[PDB]
Amino acid sequence: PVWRKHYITYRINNYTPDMNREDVDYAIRKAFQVWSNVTPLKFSKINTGMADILVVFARGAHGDDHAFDGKGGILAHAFGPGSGIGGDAHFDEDEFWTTHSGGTNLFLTAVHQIGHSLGLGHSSDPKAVMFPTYKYVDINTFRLSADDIRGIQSLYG
Ligand SMILES: CC(=O)N[C@H]1[C@H](OCCCn2cc(CN([C@@H](C(=O)O)C(C)C)S(=O)(=O)c3ccc(-c4ccccc4)cc3)nn2)O[C@H](COC(C)=O)[C@@H](OC(C)=O)[C@@H]1OC(C)=O
Ligand SMILES: [Ca+2]
Ligand SMILES: [Ca+2]
Ligand SMILES: [Ca+2]
Ligand SMILES: [Zn+2]
Ligand SMILES: [Zn+2]
């Protein structure tokens, strides 16, 4: 249930019009960084070819048999480690993605979904990033909880 290599590629398949491109790239890259800070994994954005983790913005039905649901409800989903669609993280474009507190924060959502792309389940600690409910936390004080660190290190340490 894990990536069996420690150099992992991602590609941004497409950009949400909600946010400037620069802010999308920065959110995503920072989100990956959160995990590469507590494991030996290295993440590399690529701009051509097939990436391990593909990052997709889409609405409703988008060709994976798990349609999204409009504004609210499900925000995003992600497939666990594997080939093809494995690892891929999809973000519901009917949300309003933002760099701060308005709408839904892309960074925080990405940290969570990349958790799942890496093989994590959910946490019972409301402080954890892998807690199952979205809430805006102070990104200046953001930090992985002990539960996240133990989970991720059990897979990749
Ligand atoms: C679990 C849940 O909250 N479901 C909500 C319900 O969701 C239906 C789908 C059930 N569900 C939710 C999830 C968790 N999500 C994904 C996940 O775990 O990644 C999976 C689909 C892959 S998620 O989209 O909801 C999700 C994504 C990111 C995060 C996250 C982001 C940042 C930090 C931490 C967590 C949390 C949840 N799994 N199944 O929608 C309803 C309507 O939504 C509106 C208008 O906001 C919710 O009603 C509200 C807000 O009161 C409803 O709340 C209830 C009763 O469960
Ligand atoms: Ca939705
Ligand atoms: Ca993949
Ligand atoms: Ca949107
Ligand atoms: Zn999908
Ligand atoms: Zn989740």
UniProtKB/Swiss-Prot annotation:
Induction, as annotated: By exposure to bacterial lipopolysaccharides (LPS). Inhibited by dexamethasone.
Amino acids binding Ca(2+) 1: D18, E93, E95
Catalytic residues of the enzyme: Q113
Binding-site positions, Ca(2+) 3: D69, G70, G72, I74, D92, E95
Tissue: Found in alveolar macrophages but not in peripheral blood monocytes.
Positions of Zn(2+) 1 binding: H62, D64, H77, H90
Binding-site residues for Ca(2+) 2, renumbered to this chain: D52, G84, G86, D88
Protein localization: Secreted, Extracellular space, Extracellular matrix
Binding site for Zn(2+) 2: H112, H116, H122
Superkingdom field: Eukaryota
Family: Belongs to the peptidase M10A family.
UniProt free text on domains: The conserved cysteine present in the cysteine-switch motif binds the catalytic zinc ion, thus inhibiting the enzyme. The dissociation of the cysteine from the zinc ion upon the activation-peptide release activates the enzyme.
Role summary: May be involved in tissue injury and remodeling. Has significant elastolytic activity. Can accept large and small amino acids at the P1' site, but has a preference for leucine. Aromatic or hydrophobic residues are preferred at the P1 site, with small hydrophobic residues (preferably alanine) occupying P3.
Descriptive protein name: Macrophage metalloelastase
Source lineage: Eukaryota, Metazoa, Chordata, Craniata, Vertebrata
Gene: MMP12
